[PDB]
Short mmCIF file of C-alpha atoms and ligand atoms in Angstrom, two decimals:
data_model
loop_
_atom_site.label_atom_id
_atom_site.label_comp_id
_atom_site.label_asym_id
_atom_site.label_seq_id
_atom_site.Cartn_x
_atom_site.Cartn_y
_atom_site.Cartn_z
CA UNK A 23 0.00 0.00 0.00
CA UNK A 24 2.06 2.89 -1.42
CA UNK A 25 -0.56 5.39 -0.18
CA UNK A 26 -1.21 3.98 3.29
CA UNK A 27 -4.29 2.48 4.86
CA UNK A 28 -7.81 3.92 4.71
CA UNK A 29 -8.43 6.81 7.06
CA UNK A 30 -11.30 9.00 8.22
CA UNK A 31 -11.72 11.92 5.81
CA UNK A 32 -13.65 14.40 8.01
CA UNK A 33 -10.97 13.97 10.68
CA UNK A 34 -8.28 14.54 8.04
CA UNK A 35 -10.06 17.71 6.91
CA UNK A 36 -10.38 19.08 10.46
CA UNK A 37 -6.72 18.33 11.19
CA UNK A 38 -5.68 20.36 8.11
CA UNK A 39 -8.22 23.17 8.55
CA UNK A 40 -5.32 25.63 9.00
CA UNK A 41 -4.12 24.91 5.46
CA UNK A 42 -7.64 25.10 3.98
CA UNK A 43 -7.55 28.90 4.37
CA UNK A 44 -5.31 31.71 2.96
CA UNK A 45 -2.47 31.85 2.08
CA UNK A 46 -2.08 28.18 1.08
CA UNK A 47 -5.80 27.35 0.80
CA UNK A 48 -5.55 23.81 -0.56
CA UNK A 49 -3.85 20.55 0.34
CA UNK A 50 -3.15 17.40 -1.67
CA UNK A 51 -4.07 14.13 0.03
CA UNK A 52 -1.51 11.79 -1.52
CA UNK A 53 1.88 12.36 -3.14
CA UNK A 54 3.35 11.00 -6.40
CA UNK A 55 0.05 9.38 -7.37
CA UNK A 56 -1.64 9.24 -10.73
CA UNK A 57 -4.90 10.56 -9.27
CA UNK A 58 -4.25 14.05 -7.92
CA UNK A 59 -6.62 14.31 -4.94
CA UNK A 60 -6.94 17.81 -3.47
CA UNK A 61 -9.09 19.46 -0.81
CA UNK A 62 -9.61 23.16 -1.57
CA UNK A 63 -10.83 25.56 1.08
CA UNK A 64 -11.61 29.26 1.21
CA UNK A 65 -11.96 32.03 1.03
CA UNK A 66 -10.36 32.58 -2.36
CA UNK A 67 -11.25 34.49 -5.50
CA UNK A 68 -9.23 34.48 -8.70
CA UNK A 69 -9.40 35.86 -12.22
CA UNK A 70 -7.64 33.11 -14.18
CA UNK A 71 -9.43 30.49 -16.29
CA UNK A 72 -7.93 26.98 -16.37
CA UNK A 73 -7.89 25.05 -19.65
CA UNK A 74 -7.33 21.49 -18.37
CA UNK A 75 -6.80 18.80 -21.04
CA UNK A 76 -8.31 16.13 -18.75
CA UNK A 77 -11.47 15.90 -16.66
CA UNK A 78 -11.94 17.41 -13.19
CA UNK A 79 -14.23 15.90 -10.55
CA UNK A 80 -15.65 18.09 -7.80
CA UNK A 81 -17.51 17.14 -4.62
CA UNK A 82 -18.31 20.20 -2.49
CA UNK A 83 -18.10 18.66 0.97
CA UNK A 84 -18.55 21.74 3.16
CA UNK A 85 -19.94 25.15 2.32
CA UNK A 86 -20.50 26.58 -1.13
CA UNK A 87 -18.43 27.70 -4.11
CA UNK A 88 -18.93 28.23 -7.81
CA UNK A 89 -17.22 28.02 -11.20
CA UNK A 90 -17.11 30.85 -13.69
CA UNK A 91 -17.00 29.13 -17.09
CA UNK A 92 -17.03 29.81 -20.81
CA UNK A 93 -19.68 27.75 -22.66
CA UNK A 94 -20.38 28.02 -26.44
CA UNK A 95 -18.83 31.49 -26.07
CA UNK A 96 -20.84 32.83 -23.14
CA UNK A 97 -19.82 33.61 -19.55
CA UNK A 98 -21.71 31.09 -17.40
CA UNK A 99 -21.72 30.15 -13.74
CA UNK A 100 -21.83 26.62 -12.35
CA UNK A 101 -22.74 26.54 -8.66
CA UNK A 102 -21.11 24.07 -6.27
CA UNK A 103 -23.66 24.05 -3.47
CA UNK A 104 -22.72 21.95 -0.45
CA UNK A 105 -23.23 18.30 -1.34
CA UNK A 106 -23.02 18.86 -5.12
CA UNK A 107 -20.85 16.73 -7.35
CA UNK A 108 -19.72 17.80 -10.78
CA UNK A 109 -17.62 16.34 -13.60
CA UNK A 110 -16.00 18.93 -15.87
CA UNK A 111 -15.19 17.88 -19.46
CA UNK A 112 -11.72 18.58 -20.83
CA UNK A 113 -10.78 22.08 -22.01
CA UNK A 114 -13.82 23.84 -20.52
CA UNK A 115 -12.34 27.09 -19.22
CA UNK A 116 -13.07 27.47 -15.51
CA UNK A 117 -12.25 29.92 -12.71
CA UNK A 118 -13.33 28.56 -9.32
CA UNK A 119 -14.52 31.10 -6.76
CA UNK A 120 -14.50 29.93 -3.14
CA UNK A 121 -15.92 32.74 -1.00
CA UNK A 122 -16.80 30.82 2.15
CA UNK A 123 -14.39 30.42 5.01
CA UNK A 124 -14.27 26.90 6.40
CA UNK A 125 -15.43 25.31 3.16
CA UNK A 126 -13.98 22.15 1.62
CA UNK A 127 -14.28 20.74 -1.90
CA UNK A 128 -12.84 17.39 -2.97
CA UNK A 129 -11.16 17.90 -6.34
CA UNK A 130 -9.81 14.90 -8.23
CA UNK A 131 -7.86 15.10 -11.50
CA UNK A 132 -4.89 13.16 -12.91
CA UNK A 133 -1.26 13.67 -13.86
CA UNK A 134 -0.79 15.04 -17.33
CA UNK A 135 1.45 12.91 -19.56
CA UNK A 136 4.46 14.50 -21.20
CA UNK A 137 3.41 16.90 -23.95
CA UNK A 138 -0.18 17.30 -22.77
CA UNK A 139 -0.31 20.92 -21.67
CA UNK A 140 -2.46 23.00 -19.35
CA UNK A 141 -3.47 26.52 -20.30
CA UNK A 142 -4.18 29.48 -18.06
CA UNK A 143 -6.16 32.36 -19.51
CA UNK A 144 -7.46 35.81 -18.66
CA UNK A 145 -10.37 37.49 -20.43
CA UNK A 146 -11.24 41.17 -20.62
CA UNK A 147 -14.09 42.27 -18.33
CA UNK A 148 -15.09 44.88 -20.95
CA UNK A 149 -15.13 43.26 -24.39
CA UNK A 150 -14.62 39.61 -23.40
CA UNK A 151 -11.69 38.99 -25.75
CA UNK A 152 -8.79 36.76 -24.65
CA UNK A 153 -6.13 38.91 -22.93
CA UNK A 154 -3.27 36.48 -22.17
CA UNK A 155 -2.70 32.71 -22.16
CA UNK A 156 0.19 30.65 -20.75
CA UNK A 157 0.59 26.98 -21.67
CA UNK A 158 2.41 24.91 -19.06
CA UNK A 159 3.51 21.34 -18.51
CA UNK A 160 1.82 20.88 -15.15
CA UNK A 161 4.09 18.66 -13.06
CA UNK A 162 3.31 20.24 -9.68
CA UNK A 163 0.36 22.59 -9.10
CA UNK A 164 1.54 24.35 -5.92
CA UNK A 165 4.93 24.97 -7.55
CA UNK A 166 4.60 25.94 -11.23
CA UNK A 167 1.56 28.17 -10.65
CA UNK A 168 2.20 31.05 -8.18
CA UNK A 169 5.12 32.52 -10.19
CA UNK A 170 3.10 32.18 -13.41
CA UNK A 171 0.29 34.21 -11.85
CA UNK A 172 2.73 36.70 -10.34
CA UNK A 173 4.10 37.52 -13.80
CA UNK A 174 0.64 38.23 -15.22
CA UNK A 175 -0.21 40.57 -12.34
CA UNK A 176 3.16 42.32 -12.71
CA UNK A 177 3.02 43.07 -16.46
CA UNK A 178 0.62 45.64 -17.90
CA UNK A 179 1.69 44.38 -21.31
CA UNK A 180 0.27 40.91 -20.57
CA UNK A 181 -2.94 42.37 -19.08
CA UNK A 182 -3.46 44.65 -22.11
CA UNK A 183 -6.42 43.52 -24.21
CA UNK A 184 -5.45 43.06 -27.89
CA UNK A 185 -8.93 44.17 -28.99
CA UNK A 186 -9.81 47.24 -26.94
CA UNK A 187 -6.69 48.17 -24.93
CA UNK A 188 -8.28 47.94 -21.48
CA UNK A 189 -5.64 46.75 -18.99
CA UNK A 190 -6.93 43.76 -17.02
CA UNK A 191 -6.84 44.39 -13.24
CA UNK A 192 -4.96 41.24 -12.10
CA UNK B 23 -21.09 20.66 -20.25
CA UNK B 24 -21.09 17.11 -21.65
CA UNK B 25 -21.91 15.71 -18.18
CA UNK B 26 -24.58 18.20 -17.10
CA UNK B 27 -24.68 20.73 -14.30
CA UNK B 28 -23.69 20.11 -10.69
CA UNK B 29 -26.27 18.26 -8.64
CA UNK B 30 -26.86 17.18 -5.05
CA UNK B 31 -25.14 13.84 -4.43
CA UNK B 32 -27.06 12.61 -1.34
CA UNK B 33 -30.31 13.22 -3.24
CA UNK B 34 -28.89 11.33 -6.23
CA UNK B 35 -27.96 8.42 -3.94
CA UNK B 36 -31.41 8.27 -2.32
CA UNK B 37 -33.12 8.39 -5.72
CA UNK B 38 -31.08 5.37 -6.87
CA UNK B 39 -31.25 3.44 -3.58
CA UNK B 40 -33.16 0.65 -5.40
CA UNK B 41 -30.14 0.02 -7.64
CA UNK B 42 -27.66 0.16 -4.74
CA UNK B 43 -28.87 -3.28 -3.58
CA UNK B 44 -28.93 -6.80 -5.17
CA UNK B 45 -29.09 -7.80 -7.97
CA UNK B 46 -27.51 -4.77 -9.68
CA UNK B 47 -25.84 -3.28 -6.58
CA UNK B 48 -23.90 -0.45 -8.22
CA UNK B 49 -24.59 2.48 -10.51
CA UNK B 50 -22.28 4.66 -12.61
CA UNK B 51 -22.84 8.41 -12.30
CA UNK B 52 -21.75 9.57 -15.76
CA UNK B 53 -21.51 7.82 -19.12
CA UNK B 54 -18.71 7.80 -21.72
CA UNK B 55 -16.37 9.74 -19.42
CA UNK B 56 -12.69 9.24 -18.79
CA UNK B 57 -13.25 9.14 -15.02
CA UNK B 58 -15.46 6.16 -14.23
CA UNK B 59 -17.47 7.31 -11.20
CA UNK B 60 -19.47 4.57 -9.48
CA UNK B 61 -21.57 4.30 -6.32
CA UNK B 62 -21.49 0.74 -4.95
CA UNK B 63 -24.05 -0.44 -2.42
CA UNK B 64 -24.71 -3.67 -0.57
CA UNK B 65 -25.03 -6.23 0.53
CA UNK B 66 -22.56 -8.09 -1.66
CA UNK B 67 -19.80 -10.61 -1.09
CA UNK B 68 -17.52 -11.99 -3.78
CA UNK B 69 -14.54 -14.28 -4.13
CA UNK B 70 -12.72 -12.68 -7.08
CA UNK B 71 -9.62 -10.49 -6.76
CA UNK B 72 -9.28 -7.58 -9.21
CA UNK B 73 -5.86 -6.77 -10.67
CA UNK B 74 -6.46 -3.20 -11.90
CA UNK B 75 -3.59 -1.61 -13.89
CA UNK B 76 -4.62 1.89 -12.70
CA UNK B 77 -5.45 3.41 -9.32
CA UNK B 78 -8.80 3.14 -7.54
CA UNK B 79 -10.14 5.82 -5.20
CA UNK B 80 -12.68 4.91 -2.52
CA UNK B 81 -14.78 7.14 -0.27
CA UNK B 82 -17.14 5.10 1.93
CA UNK B 83 -20.05 7.53 2.18
CA UNK B 84 -22.58 5.40 4.08
CA UNK B 85 -22.09 2.28 6.15
CA UNK B 86 -19.04 0.05 6.19
CA UNK B 87 -17.23 -2.32 3.85
CA UNK B 88 -13.78 -3.81 3.50
CA UNK B 89 -11.19 -4.99 0.99
CA UNK B 90 -9.55 -8.39 1.08
CA UNK B 91 -6.09 -7.82 -0.42
CA UNK B 92 -2.81 -9.55 -1.16
CA UNK B 93 0.21 -7.61 0.18
CA UNK B 94 3.86 -8.84 -0.08
CA UNK B 95 2.26 -12.30 -0.37
CA UNK B 96 -0.07 -12.23 2.63
CA UNK B 97 -3.86 -12.11 2.86
CA UNK B 98 -4.67 -8.72 4.41
CA UNK B 99 -7.82 -6.75 5.09
CA UNK B 100 -8.30 -3.04 4.51
CA UNK B 101 -11.37 -1.67 6.28
CA UNK B 102 -13.57 0.99 4.67
CA UNK B 103 -15.30 2.39 7.73
CA UNK B 104 -17.93 5.04 7.03
CA UNK B 105 -16.16 8.27 6.18
CA UNK B 106 -12.87 6.59 5.18
CA UNK B 107 -11.08 7.44 1.96
CA UNK B 108 -8.53 5.17 0.35
CA UNK B 109 -6.32 5.24 -2.75
CA UNK B 110 -5.33 1.80 -4.06
CA UNK B 111 -2.07 1.54 -6.04
CA UNK B 112 -2.11 -0.27 -9.38
CA UNK B 113 -2.10 -4.08 -9.50
CA UNK B 114 -2.84 -4.61 -5.80
CA UNK B 115 -5.23 -7.57 -5.86
CA UNK B 116 -8.48 -6.66 -4.11
CA UNK B 117 -11.85 -8.29 -3.41
CA UNK B 118 -14.32 -5.78 -1.94
CA UNK B 119 -16.83 -7.12 0.57
CA UNK B 120 -19.90 -4.96 1.15
CA UNK B 121 -22.01 -6.64 3.85
CA UNK B 122 -24.20 -3.72 4.90
CA UNK B 123 -27.53 -3.02 3.32
CA UNK B 124 -28.09 0.64 2.52
CA UNK B 125 -24.38 1.41 2.27
CA UNK B 126 -22.76 3.57 -0.40
CA UNK B 127 -19.12 3.90 -1.46
CA UNK B 128 -17.89 6.39 -4.05
CA UNK B 129 -15.46 4.55 -6.32
CA UNK B 130 -13.52 6.49 -8.95
CA UNK B 131 -11.20 4.90 -11.54
CA UNK B 132 -10.47 5.65 -15.21
CA UNK B 133 -10.90 4.10 -18.64
CA UNK B 134 -8.17 1.69 -19.57
CA UNK B 135 -6.40 2.53 -22.83
CA UNK B 136 -6.24 -0.09 -25.55
CA UNK B 137 -3.88 -2.92 -24.59
CA UNK B 138 -3.86 -2.16 -20.86
CA UNK B 139 -5.62 -5.17 -19.38
CA UNK B 140 -7.48 -5.94 -16.19
CA UNK B 141 -7.05 -9.28 -14.46
CA UNK B 142 -9.51 -11.21 -12.34
CA UNK B 143 -8.14 -13.90 -10.05
CA UNK B 144 -9.25 -16.57 -7.61
CA UNK B 145 -7.02 -18.02 -4.89
CA UNK B 146 -7.36 -21.32 -3.05
CA UNK B 147 -8.76 -21.04 0.49
CA UNK B 148 -6.59 -24.03 1.51
CA UNK B 149 -3.06 -23.54 0.16
CA UNK B 150 -3.35 -19.96 -1.13
CA UNK B 151 -2.03 -20.72 -4.62
CA UNK B 152 -3.51 -18.95 -7.66
CA UNK B 153 -6.44 -21.01 -9.02
CA UNK B 154 -7.55 -19.15 -12.17
CA UNK B 155 -6.93 -15.76 -13.81
CA UNK B 156 -8.74 -14.05 -16.71
CA UNK B 157 -7.23 -11.00 -18.41
CA UNK B 158 -9.78 -8.70 -20.02
CA UNK B 159 -9.87 -5.44 -21.94
CA UNK B 160 -12.30 -3.66 -19.66
CA UNK B 161 -14.48 -1.46 -21.86
CA UNK B 162 -17.68 -1.76 -19.79
CA UNK B 163 -17.74 -3.13 -16.23
CA UNK B 164 -21.44 -4.08 -15.97
CA UNK B 165 -21.20 -5.87 -19.32
CA UNK B 166 -17.92 -7.80 -19.69
CA UNK B 167 -17.93 -9.04 -16.08
CA UNK B 168 -21.03 -11.13 -15.17
CA UNK B 169 -20.47 -13.72 -17.94
CA UNK B 170 -16.77 -13.93 -17.02
CA UNK B 171 -17.72 -14.74 -13.42
CA UNK B 172 -20.45 -17.14 -14.54
CA UNK B 173 -17.90 -19.21 -16.45
CA UNK B 174 -15.61 -19.55 -13.43
CA UNK B 175 -18.48 -20.69 -11.20
CA UNK B 176 -19.64 -23.16 -13.88
CA UNK B 177 -16.31 -24.94 -14.50
CA UNK B 178 -14.75 -27.23 -11.91
CA UNK B 179 -11.69 -27.31 -14.16
CA UNK B 180 -11.15 -23.56 -13.68
CA UNK B 181 -11.77 -23.77 -9.92
CA UNK B 182 -9.32 -26.69 -9.55
CA UNK B 183 -6.16 -25.61 -7.72
CA UNK B 184 -3.00 -26.50 -9.70
CA UNK B 185 -1.08 -27.09 -6.46
CA UNK B 186 -3.34 -29.15 -4.21
CA UNK B 187 -6.42 -30.09 -6.28
CA UNK B 188 -9.01 -28.51 -3.99
CA UNK B 189 -11.92 -27.23 -6.11
CA UNK B 190 -12.65 -23.59 -5.31
CA UNK B 191 -16.29 -23.07 -4.21
CA UNK B 192 -17.28 -20.20 -6.58
N1 3HA C 201 -9.02 24.55 -10.54
C1 3HA C 201 -8.60 23.56 -9.53
C2 3HA C 201 -7.62 22.68 -9.96
O1 3HA C 201 -7.13 22.80 -11.27
C3 3HA C 201 -7.11 21.69 -9.11
C4 3HA C 201 -7.58 21.57 -7.82
C5 3HA C 201 -8.58 22.46 -7.39
C6 3HA C 201 -9.11 23.47 -8.20
C7 3HA C 201 -10.21 24.35 -7.55
O2 3HA C 201 -11.42 24.05 -7.75
O3 3HA C 201 -10.01 25.34 -6.78
N1 3HA C 202 -13.75 -3.35 -7.41
C1 3HA C 202 -14.60 -2.22 -7.82
C2 3HA C 202 -14.34 -1.74 -9.10
O1 3HA C 202 -13.32 -2.34 -9.86
C3 3HA C 202 -15.07 -0.68 -9.64
C4 3HA C 202 -16.08 -0.08 -8.90
C5 3HA C 202 -16.34 -0.57 -7.62
C6 3HA C 202 -15.64 -1.62 -7.04
C7 3HA C 202 -16.06 -2.01 -5.59
O2 3HA C 202 -15.42 -1.53 -4.63
O3 3HA C 202 -17.05 -2.75 -5.29
FE1 FE2 C 203 -8.77 23.31 -13.01
FE1 FE2 C 204 -11.06 44.11 -24.06
FE1 FE2 C 205 -11.30 -2.98 -8.65
FE1 FE2 C 206 -4.90 -25.12 -3.24
#
């Protein structure tokens, strides 16, 4: 048993409640596994949309959150009310908002094989055009992602909309 | 959204409680998805060990169950007490026992690519040698599996231990 014995999940969540809040906000259950199993807390808001080449499974265990999405070309909102499960198809752009303190969502995805890339995108609040997109070989979420986001926030050139010139707030 | 909107999971489980019991016993949440998401009920006991080439994630939502396993070469038992989560590494032989009526376990695995095969095994209760093993390209669980099991139960030749001659009960 490379990942240990079964264990009580609510107890696990309580014991890590101090990570399920800012600044870290999320914690991965098992390490070096093909299934990436994460518990995400709150509060947290973000402006980035994730373009994940594989599926994402959500189970909102405690509290509520929601997913800003793009569907057919429209800004839509998928609610994760407490007790909801959701399976997100590949490449559906999504920006999870987790406003509630003390909330917990089980998120399961899997390791991306070599050459299968994740995208992170920002759209313009004014005209809705794509503002900036970074493709990344996601090997470690908590590690390849903060500095990527920091560079977008720190460059007005990246935040500048190619269509209307509005500078995204970051 | 190829798999629909979020939805309340406890409600879903209640509404399918009549499938989470014999003869069917389990129900898959979404169809034609890369993540195979299943809710397994009870009661059910079985003698087969599954050799799955990919990981299996368990979350025992209601009631209790357990997993007979082989580890290093020993018969071991992994308990799924209500509220336990568990991640099973690939190829660890496992035979889930689900004795409790009205129980529910979330089981998540993924579609096997072409040429990656599942194995199903039976061991001898007397000397512990391997008695019979079928490799299968698992494309649909509820479909390729009953007739496979029916053939093992129906053939004393398959149940006959190569080491000691005891005929497995099936
Ligand atoms: N967007 C997410 C991700 O890509 C991995 C784990 C969690 C989330 C999230 O819902 O916050
Ligand atoms: N062994 C299982 C499997 O291979 C798929 C879904 C459920 C189970 C189970 O735990 O009963
Ligand atoms: Fe994502
Ligand atoms: Fe714009
Ligand atoms: Fe299995
Ligand atoms: Fe035997």
